[PDB]
Amino acid sequence: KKSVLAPVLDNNPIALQVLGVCSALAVTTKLETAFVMTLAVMFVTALSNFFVSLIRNHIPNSVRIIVQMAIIASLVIVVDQILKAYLYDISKQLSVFVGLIITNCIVMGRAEAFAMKSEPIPSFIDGIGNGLGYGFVLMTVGFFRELLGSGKLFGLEVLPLISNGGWYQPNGLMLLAPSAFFLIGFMIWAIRTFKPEQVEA
Amino acid sequence: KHEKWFALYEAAATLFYTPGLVTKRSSHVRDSVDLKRIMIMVWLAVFPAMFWGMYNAGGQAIAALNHLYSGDQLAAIVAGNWHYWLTEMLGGTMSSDAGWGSKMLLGATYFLPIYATVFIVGGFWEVLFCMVRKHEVNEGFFVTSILFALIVPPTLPLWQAALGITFGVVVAKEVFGGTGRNFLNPALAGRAFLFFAYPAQISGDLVWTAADGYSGATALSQWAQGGAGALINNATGQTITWMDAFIGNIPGSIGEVSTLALMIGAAFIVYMGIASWRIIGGVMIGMILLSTLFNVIGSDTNAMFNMPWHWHLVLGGFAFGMFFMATDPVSASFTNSGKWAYGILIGVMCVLIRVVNPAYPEGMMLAILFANLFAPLFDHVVVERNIKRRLARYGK
Amino acid sequence: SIKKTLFVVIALSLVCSIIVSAAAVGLRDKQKENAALDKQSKILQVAGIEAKGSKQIVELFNKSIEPRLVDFNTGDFVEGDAANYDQRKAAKEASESIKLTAEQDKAKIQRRANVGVVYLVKDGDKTSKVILPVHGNGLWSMMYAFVAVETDGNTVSGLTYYEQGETPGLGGEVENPAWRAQWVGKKLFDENHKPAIKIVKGGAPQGSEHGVDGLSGATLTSNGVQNTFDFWLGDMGFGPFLTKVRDG
Amino acid sequence: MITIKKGLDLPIAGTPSQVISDGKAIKKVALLGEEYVGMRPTMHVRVGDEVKKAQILFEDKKNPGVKFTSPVSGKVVEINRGAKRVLQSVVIEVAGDDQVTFDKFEANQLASLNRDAIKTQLVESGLWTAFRTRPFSKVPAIDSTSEAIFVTAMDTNPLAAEPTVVINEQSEAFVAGLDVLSALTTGKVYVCKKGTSLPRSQQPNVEEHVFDGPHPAGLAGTHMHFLYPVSADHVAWSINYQDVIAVGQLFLTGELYTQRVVSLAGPVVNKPRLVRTVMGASLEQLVDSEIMPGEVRIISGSVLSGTKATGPHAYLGRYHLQVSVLREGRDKELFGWAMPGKNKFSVTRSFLGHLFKGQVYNMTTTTNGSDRSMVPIGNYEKVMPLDMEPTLLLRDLCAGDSDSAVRLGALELDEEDLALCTFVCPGKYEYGQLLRECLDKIEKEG
Amino acid sequence: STIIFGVVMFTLIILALVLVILFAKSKLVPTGDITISINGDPEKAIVTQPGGKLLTALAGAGVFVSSACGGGGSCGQCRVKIKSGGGDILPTELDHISKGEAREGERLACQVAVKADMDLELPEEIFGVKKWECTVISNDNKATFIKELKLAIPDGESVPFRAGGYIQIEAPAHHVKYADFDVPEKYRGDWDKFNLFRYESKVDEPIIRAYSMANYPEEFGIIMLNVRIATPPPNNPNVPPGQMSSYIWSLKAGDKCTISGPFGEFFAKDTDAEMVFIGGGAGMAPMRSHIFDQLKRLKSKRKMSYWYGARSKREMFYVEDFDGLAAENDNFVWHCALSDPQPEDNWTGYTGFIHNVLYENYLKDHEAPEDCEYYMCGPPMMNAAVINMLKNLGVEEENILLDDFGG
Amino acid sequence: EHYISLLVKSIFIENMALSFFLGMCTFLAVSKKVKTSFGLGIAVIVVLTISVPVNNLVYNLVLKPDALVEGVDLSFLNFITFIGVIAALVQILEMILDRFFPPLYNALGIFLPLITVNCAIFGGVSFMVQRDYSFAESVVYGFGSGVGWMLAIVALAGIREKMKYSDVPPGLRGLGITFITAGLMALGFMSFSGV
Ligand SMILES: Cc1cc2nc3c(=O)[nH]c(=O)nc-3n(C[C@H](O)[C@H](O)[C@H](O)COP(=O)(O)OP(=O)(O)OC[C@H]3O[C@@H](n4cnc5c(N)ncnc54)[C@H](O)[C@@H]3O)c2cc1C
Ligand SMILES: Cc1cc2nc3c(=O)[nH]c(=O)nc-3n(C[C@H](O)[C@H](O)[C@H](O)CO)c2cc1C
Ligand code: FES
Ligand code: FES
């Protein structure tokens, strides 16, 4: 339990580490896409970590990148096939970042730092925990962005819009690039104020 | 008690009276210039622009109302908007025969609320940051607030102004340490926040004239639509001459319209040395060069290609941005050659956005932000060349 | 030991290869249905037919919608795999597309497919309306839409912008149900058989035969829509086909 | 020859009469510990000890072999130490005439003396402390040598003495000192002066360079930047004209020469003028009965770069050849920052004062504002004639970036060089202290 | 059919990529074993295959480099002079190596990656590292939390060390219980109070630690160490106890202990200035080595004072030796300050913290405290207090020598 | 020609860093010194201009639907066929530089490890695939994307060097202020969005 929750606030992959930022600023526009991305990242990272741990003893070590990318890419391709089969609209919304999950620095970070020198079960659980932390950041950013940019949560109208005879005027910036940057920065600010040990000297 | 308010109290005490501080070391005699006087000089430089902006906004609103409505209908609308009947109660008249006094009063009714809201909200954020961080309140917020209030449509909602100034002060300035420690322009940061977050209230045809129910495109949009021949003032039905744009008798933000008032204030501050004439010269050089290039190339489908440089100067917020926004010293480059490059980049980028960017009729703010991003690179190039000279002992 | 490294990488690239290839091939058929049902649902929505769920969508689309291919140059029906026709891909190839000049390219589309796909909605054994896919360049990105034309060939029964990248609130109002519903009852052509649908800036007069209110503060997107409807109803667009529909 | 156009001449009222007179008798002299950069004293005397003219008072732990000798013969009365037992000063009450003599040579052989002999005599007499290595403004090491010794024969500091007047009466001593320096230097001696004629040394090593322009032209750092650019591996020594006269007198008469001509000046000096005194003369006694009533600040050296003369530090500096007395500007004015500055001096043109050309301002010590973050408006570039980017270097100094500051030329600057940048700073930053901190960090890490 | 074609194309592409990588590695990367010259002697030149850190290659050879943090580049005790090769200095090294030493060529072997021919100028001390399997003479308690480990070197030989130096003791995997420790009843009060006997230490792999000597060079044939028990802190009792400290406290007479060295960098300055020694806890070990070395070997006449901080009388030790030195040497004096003397101590001397007593009694009236050389070693709190007090007295950091135990 | 328009699109209008949030982990990490940021920019330029055309060839000659055997498309092997090629080319470039071009290896090869299978490279190649680009167009697009990414990272490095004087609140120091700076950079860079 401690290791699963460790990368949520104590060692968050995006707040403390800088892994997985690229997907955070792109798929957070909607909570549906953000949540599906969290699930996909958790699944891919956990399975890749488990397999790499299973093959953590006999690897070329000369094409290390090729081998540790083959498993990740196969898993990401299978996940892409599933997402295009089930939840095709979500796959379309994710656009190209479904593929980028192979290069998502979280997966390699936990494949090399942990899965290469750990037992398969703890490697899988650590991958699940890191995916959970990344998805926590993703869901917070996406919640704020969707709520303040469309007045909707998971596609359900929460704040009535003037265009639909409501009262709330959507904030367009929440649907653009800088909003994700600012939200991540301020979330890091809050996390590091509540956890001063992470403050950088 | 009340120590938590000390940071604010001192700000008042230092504002009314100069501190009795004396030099402790280094040079025992200091220059009479202080940040307070520089900020107040910049604040006074836009006073002619602010007053003429109020007058122009009032005149445009009155002309549009008289051109649209008449008779009892006019009275009804005058009773429907608090600006109009507040002007009436104060002695002003909404009729076409209104003098300069009534127009200025209506412009005040439209501007003073925005300026007051911006000042209060931004000052609350600044003072909150100072008290929480045990800093001393700076005077840059005065210039930031006035400039932000002078670059928004007269019909901007008060809450939108509050959000814009909050973004410009907190995200762009305070998180970077406050006055003198940021790299972006707070006023333009807030204006861009409003530009990209609530484009409906800071763009189009229904916001640049204070007359409710009136839809009129500005000079820049009209030029883009149909070239120089399309520059017609619907409210008065009279063509917008170059002199009209230069004086500032056109729809637009409060204080941006008049190139003459901005020229006077900019000349005063530039003579005082507060504003870098190198940045202004660079902006002029870039705008002139790119405008002449586009004119030479020409275009049968894009009218903007045929706009002369002098029309670029007097249209939109080019003058205001060049004088009181491009000259922001903190966001500008810190080297003279870097200042020239920064100004040239600002001018070129503004002309590019004006001409070859259909989405944005004007690109002064976007150009300034883009050049703010790259001013450190010009500084880096200049210092690298200087260091290369130094390592050669200056050829000695 | 290069031997062991090569053997292990080969075995890995065999097992993961089998997994990936089997997953891709097995789901390939399903990928087609899932991709198609979105456009089918959009056709049902514009057609005025209500459908919920994939099964209902496919059933109703097969029961009531007949896709067909039309030649723009001659405005006549042609034989082909209309159900499996990709107009977007066809427009990108010189064999099944033509390059539009500056004068003819009113909608600012680089290439126009030689053969387009329409959808006949038939209440019974006879067609009740025709859904035409019309697309044109907007302010930010290409906007695609379906327009429902009555059998008379002049009246528009509905409109839906199923693909449009524009600023929400300003340019995204094409998705607003009220603006789309404002198109119902409008006439595409005038008495002379010339395009007449106009997007009036500032609000069209009430009851106008061809006047539709433009998007507020979004003159550029409205101009793009007007250019789209003027080009696609012209001689080089669906004009001849609509004339044939008018005469049967 | 070399003309400076970027600078600022402070027009402070009370310019010296440029006539040398006899100053008040001095019955107390002192040596200031903090006047020397990076000096950790090892005391050789105690309170009540009797010292001769050139008897060692304390030695340098960081610079072994460097001897700080007394300026006058007398009895040590006190050894003032401040925070952390830092040697604030050593005070000697003048008494008697006992002196320590050295070798004396004729003027026709000073150019042919061995370098080691010159170094030994200078170090023993304590005159070696006159020199200053530019990269860090420290006294040169005993065994070290330099290929560029800069004789600052010009004084452009506000209310500064005219070096021509002082030199004309000690021409023989100045020429002897120039010859001694020419023999001492490994390379050349740079006599940086104004257009006015000064005594010339026939030695080819000595070269005269004319610098014309505002105050910065008269600082040693500017001369080195324009003639012998300095770096970590290129060290240039600096010495003032009066110290050159002292060297000449030491090598001619064989006795330490401590007489100096210092300009007593300032808005509150009744009769500003050049007065003869001794090294480290007591400023409290020097300015006795020569100051207007009121609270005033006495400064050793120029107002732009000087030391407050109060308590332990109320003694003439080793490298200071001028006393400036200012008024304490502790009065608070209502909206004083918004009034038309008819009597306000500023590098910018935001005050009416600049309109009245030729005006003289009774400048006080008031900061004319509060501490604020640096907001460049081009003042630093206006007042910095060196081939540097002053604004970015000052930002480096403020941020403590020692490496970046060095890359931009911090090694070539002394606290006096940045005095004008401190003067024209809207934020009221004391760049001298920041530069000294950065240089100390560089020396410690290096 | 599609599956097979896709599979074969997949295998072909991956195999081609990996084959290109392998062929490039073979043709481009010289597999020839690297050679590093140590001190310029051909005999000491070490031929090691590419890969690994410099510290491992040096340890494999006959030259041993002191290392505490290991392969982390954190302690900085493995500094080496790399005249050529090794590339640039990585950022982590600069944290422990200053710019001037970087110019000289000081680098961390544990952090330096061996990838090309390198030239090294390791000193004689690092070159001349020797090991001994000494026999434990006695491990009696000299205080509540300090034990004196006496080691008889084999064959009566002596470690060629210098006063203030230290050695490195290595321990294998073991298991010890605090109950087994032979703690005299006189020193069992605190152990019983805090139930310190509960703790047990288990080590699964060989480890090595540093420890200073309590004997000066002429004390032939013996090595004396003052080892403090690194018990878990009271605020964190459940954390594992000190590994090496517990291991040494578990040793008894006749046990065999493996040591290596000598090492050290805290050495007396060669000057005639006065010397002020400040000691706390285990700091008595190195400290003693100096004073005796100053009087027995060097026979120096420098004025010397020693000041030891302690809690109670029982915490003190070596009283007879220092008292005899003071009686036989008029230029040496010593004092002990007890922070909390016990009623049974019947103490009438200095009380409180050592730094306060030293300042009030000696440095306050000292005419030139800055001219004295201060050697100091003790607990981190005492260390910080003493350093702050001395700095407030104007003593430069050079005159202040600290033997930081890392506590 | 159309190549110049494509280059300007890939540099300014379509910026891989700010407009697409690609390479942020490295873009927000090594964006501390202008020199290192410039070096990584050159490395990204080289890797992109070498990978985009090679992957374009592989896609147009092997993975293109109905290009080897009629009735079969190997589109499901896109992501991996690109990632493996990118990794192989990056490592090969590193090794050739280290053996033949020591100065280039130190200037460029040092930063390749970070670039290996980097997010930006795969993003650029996948965007190339999502569109129809010829070999010359692919080369121009890759070089332009690399130059735009270098521009963004170098500008951020310069901004951070300038910020060295800033007094950032604790907690925002380091990553948080860098994120806010990147957000402001994107706000500035959206000027070309309408183009
Ligand atoms: C040059 C030098 C000379 C030295 N000389 C001496 C000397 O003369 N005498 C001497 O006694 N020492 C000396 N030392 C220190 C010695 O090397 C050891 O640091 C010390 O003896 C501790 O030994 P240990 O391995 O048992 O402690 P460690 O195993 O390092 O334990 C450290 C402390 O932390 C606690 N701890 C362990 N794990 C945790 C955890 N997870 N959380 C919290 N706390 C934890 C332990 O209980 C213990 O109290 C010297 C060091 C150096 C560098
Ligand atoms: C000549 C001058 C121009 C300024 N222009 C602006 C501006 O356009 N916007 C703004 O917010 N602050 C402006 N300021 C105030 C301040 O310098 C600016 O906010 C800095 O970016 C932060 O202090 C200006 C100050 C001066 C002296
Ligand atoms: S072993 Fe610690 S620095 Fe190398
Ligand atoms: S750079 Fe790390 S996820 Fe893209």
Tab-separated table of C-alpha atoms in Angstrom, chain B residues 17-202:
chain	number	residue	atom	x	y	z
B	17	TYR	CA	6.395	61.632	2.430
B	18	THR	CA	9.802	60.680	1.095
B	19	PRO	CA	11.774	58.365	3.407
B	20	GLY	CA	14.366	59.931	5.668
B	21	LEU	CA	16.836	57.204	4.763
B	22	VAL	CA	20.474	58.170	4.222
B	23	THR	CA	23.202	56.389	2.288
B	24	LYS	CA	25.001	53.829	4.450
B	25	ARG	CA	27.965	52.969	2.190
B	26	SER	CA	29.227	52.954	-1.419
B	27	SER	CA	28.263	56.296	-3.024
B	28	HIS	CA	27.030	58.592	-0.260
B	29	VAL	CA	25.125	60.815	-2.728
B	30	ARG	CA	22.380	59.217	-4.821
B	31	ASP	CA	20.562	60.338	-7.946
B	32	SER	CA	17.298	62.173	-7.314
B	33	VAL	CA	15.440	59.722	-9.576
B	34	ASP	CA	13.599	56.876	-7.860
B	35	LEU	CA	11.218	54.182	-9.048
B	36	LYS	CA	8.318	56.185	-7.605
B	37	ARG	CA	9.053	59.210	-9.790
B	38	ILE	CA	9.620	57.082	-12.897
B	39	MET	CA	6.302	55.300	-12.392
B	40	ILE	CA	4.458	58.567	-11.744
B	41	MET	CA	6.013	60.171	-14.829
B	42	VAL	CA	4.842	57.233	-16.942
B	43	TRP	CA	1.420	57.484	-15.279
B	44	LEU	CA	1.194	61.179	-16.183
B	45	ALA	CA	2.396	60.489	-19.732
B	46	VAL	CA	-0.853	58.640	-20.534
B	47	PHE	CA	-3.089	61.305	-18.968
B	48	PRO	CA	-3.625	63.141	-22.292
B	49	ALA	CA	-4.271	59.787	-23.955
B	50	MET	CA	-6.684	58.763	-21.193
B	51	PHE	CA	-8.628	62.032	-21.349
B	52	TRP	CA	-8.900	62.009	-25.135
B	53	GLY	CA	-9.902	58.351	-24.995
B	54	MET	CA	-12.742	59.196	-22.633
B	55	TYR	CA	-13.827	62.061	-24.889
B	56	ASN	CA	-13.670	59.903	-28.023
B	57	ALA	CA	-15.584	57.038	-26.414
B	58	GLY	CA	-18.307	59.431	-25.303
B	59	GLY	CA	-18.513	61.078	-28.710
B	60	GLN	CA	-18.701	57.762	-30.549
B	61	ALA	CA	-21.372	56.440	-28.184
B	62	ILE	CA	-23.490	59.589	-28.500
B	63	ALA	CA	-23.157	59.666	-32.290
B	64	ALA	CA	-24.073	55.984	-32.595
B	65	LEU	CA	-27.074	56.372	-30.286
B	66	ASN	CA	-28.350	59.388	-32.224
B	67	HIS	CA	-27.781	57.640	-35.566
B	68	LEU	CA	-29.629	54.500	-34.419
B	69	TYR	CA	-32.450	55.730	-32.163
B	70	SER	CA	-34.474	58.928	-31.966
B	71	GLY	CA	-37.462	60.348	-30.146
B	72	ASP	CA	-39.075	58.391	-27.333
B	73	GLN	CA	-37.071	55.300	-28.292
B	74	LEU	CA	-33.840	57.117	-27.445
B	75	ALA	CA	-35.217	58.120	-24.051
B	76	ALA	CA	-36.130	54.495	-23.371
B	77	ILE	CA	-32.611	53.245	-24.057
B	78	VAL	CA	-31.189	56.164	-22.073
B	79	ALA	CA	-33.239	54.913	-19.128
B	80	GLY	CA	-32.176	51.310	-19.773
B	81	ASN	CA	-28.419	51.808	-19.323
B	82	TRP	CA	-26.985	53.241	-16.118
B	83	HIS	CA	-24.201	55.048	-17.990
B	84	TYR	CA	-26.651	57.113	-20.041
B	85	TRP	CA	-29.023	58.253	-17.300
B	86	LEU	CA	-26.099	58.744	-14.914
B	87	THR	CA	-24.661	61.127	-17.508
B	88	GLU	CA	-28.085	62.768	-17.772
B	89	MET	CA	-28.363	63.213	-13.998
B	90	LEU	CA	-24.930	64.879	-13.879
B	91	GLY	CA	-25.902	67.596	-16.376
B	92	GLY	CA	-24.770	65.865	-19.552
B	93	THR	CA	-27.025	65.414	-22.562
B	94	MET	CA	-27.294	62.394	-24.858
B	95	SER	CA	-28.647	64.440	-27.776
B	96	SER	CA	-26.592	64.952	-30.924
B	97	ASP	CA	-25.981	68.576	-29.868
B	98	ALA	CA	-23.936	67.417	-26.864
B	99	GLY	CA	-20.707	69.312	-26.267
B	100	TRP	CA	-17.295	68.026	-25.281
B	101	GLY	CA	-18.285	68.049	-21.610
B	102	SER	CA	-21.068	65.486	-21.953
B	103	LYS	CA	-18.931	63.252	-24.174
B	104	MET	CA	-16.079	63.349	-21.663
B	105	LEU	CA	-18.527	62.618	-18.841
B	106	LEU	CA	-19.873	59.549	-20.653
B	107	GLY	CA	-16.336	58.390	-21.388
B	108	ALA	CA	-15.609	58.779	-17.686
B	109	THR	CA	-18.692	56.748	-16.775
B	110	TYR	CA	-17.352	53.996	-19.041
B	111	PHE	CA	-13.664	54.194	-18.037
B	112	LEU	CA	-13.579	55.043	-14.320
B	113	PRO	CA	-15.455	51.845	-13.337
B	114	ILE	CA	-12.989	49.721	-15.317
B	115	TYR	CA	-9.965	51.594	-13.977
B	116	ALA	CA	-11.256	51.409	-10.400
B	117	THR	CA	-11.997	47.685	-10.621
B	118	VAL	CA	-8.589	46.981	-12.162
B	119	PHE	CA	-6.807	49.108	-9.563
B	120	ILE	CA	-8.601	47.568	-6.586
B	121	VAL	CA	-8.223	43.958	-7.734
B	122	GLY	CA	-4.603	44.240	-8.855
B	123	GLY	CA	-3.687	46.179	-5.730
B	124	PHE	CA	-5.327	43.520	-3.589
B	125	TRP	CA	-3.229	40.857	-5.307
B	126	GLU	CA	-0.021	42.913	-5.088
B	127	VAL	CA	-0.512	43.792	-1.421
B	128	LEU	CA	-1.487	40.217	-0.568
B	129	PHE	CA	1.725	38.934	-2.137
B	130	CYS	CA	3.789	41.631	-0.408
B	131	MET	CA	2.332	41.078	3.071
B	132	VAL	CA	2.512	37.289	2.805
B	133	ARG	CA	6.095	37.470	1.495
B	134	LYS	CA	7.118	40.334	3.829
B	135	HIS	CA	7.998	42.573	0.876
B	136	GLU	CA	7.526	46.315	0.420
B	137	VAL	CA	4.796	47.460	-1.961
B	138	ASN	CA	6.177	48.723	-5.272
B	139	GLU	CA	4.868	51.532	-7.467
B	140	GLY	CA	4.885	49.623	-10.764
B	141	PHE	CA	1.300	48.532	-10.203
B	142	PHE	CA	0.143	52.100	-10.855
B	143	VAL	CA	1.486	52.035	-14.415
B	144	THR	CA	0.338	48.442	-14.881
B	145	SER	CA	-3.223	49.272	-13.813
B	146	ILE	CA	-3.570	52.449	-15.869
B	147	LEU	CA	-2.094	50.845	-18.990
B	148	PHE	CA	-4.283	47.749	-18.667
B	149	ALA	CA	-7.347	49.953	-18.182
B	150	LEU	CA	-6.397	51.909	-21.330
B	151	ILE	CA	-6.130	48.839	-23.608
B	152	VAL	CA	-9.605	47.299	-23.204
B	153	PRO	CA	-12.874	48.041	-25.025
B	154	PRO	CA	-15.127	50.560	-23.266
B	155	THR	CA	-17.798	47.844	-22.905
B	156	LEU	CA	-15.558	45.260	-21.230
B	157	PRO	CA	-17.389	43.639	-18.283
B	158	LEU	CA	-15.999	44.589	-14.890
B	159	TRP	CA	-15.546	40.964	-13.816
B	160	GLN	CA	-13.618	40.260	-17.017
B	161	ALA	CA	-11.338	43.203	-16.231
B	162	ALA	CA	-10.835	41.820	-12.721
B	163	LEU	CA	-9.886	38.388	-14.067
B	164	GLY	CA	-7.558	39.891	-16.664
B	165	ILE	CA	-5.724	42.082	-14.172
B	166	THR	CA	-5.524	39.179	-11.720
B	167	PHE	CA	-3.869	37.044	-14.396
B	168	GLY	CA	-1.552	39.878	-15.419
B	169	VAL	CA	-0.451	40.642	-11.860
B	170	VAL	CA	-0.290	37.189	-10.263
B	171	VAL	CA	0.700	34.805	-13.053
B	172	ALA	CA	2.872	37.201	-15.056
B	173	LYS	CA	4.421	39.405	-12.339
B	174	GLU	CA	4.001	38.284	-8.722
B	175	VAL	CA	5.046	34.644	-9.146
B	176	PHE	CA	8.310	35.949	-10.646
B	177	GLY	CA	9.104	38.096	-7.593
B	178	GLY	CA	7.087	41.181	-8.513
B	179	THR	CA	8.164	44.536	-9.903
B	180	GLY	CA	11.470	44.453	-11.759
B	181	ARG	CA	11.853	40.663	-11.566
B	182	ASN	CA	9.491	39.353	-14.268
B	183	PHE	CA	10.156	38.856	-17.983
B	184	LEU	CA	6.692	39.462	-19.494
B	185	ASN	CA	4.433	42.500	-19.715
B	186	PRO	CA	1.721	42.296	-17.013
B	187	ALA	CA	-0.772	44.586	-18.758
B	188	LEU	CA	-0.382	42.786	-22.081
B	189	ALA	CA	-0.431	39.449	-20.253
B	190	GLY	CA	-3.859	40.286	-18.849
B	191	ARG	CA	-5.056	41.664	-22.174
B	192	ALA	CA	-3.964	38.439	-23.886
B	193	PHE	CA	-5.718	36.410	-21.194
B	194	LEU	CA	-8.911	38.282	-22.064
B	195	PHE	CA	-8.151	37.986	-25.789
B	196	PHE	CA	-7.877	34.191	-25.691
B	197	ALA	CA	-10.306	33.445	-22.845
B	198	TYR	CA	-13.252	35.748	-23.649
B	199	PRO	CA	-12.690	36.718	-27.293
B	200	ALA	CA	-16.322	37.784	-27.714
B	201	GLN	CA	-16.007	40.709	-25.280
B	202	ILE	CA	-12.656	41.992	-26.612
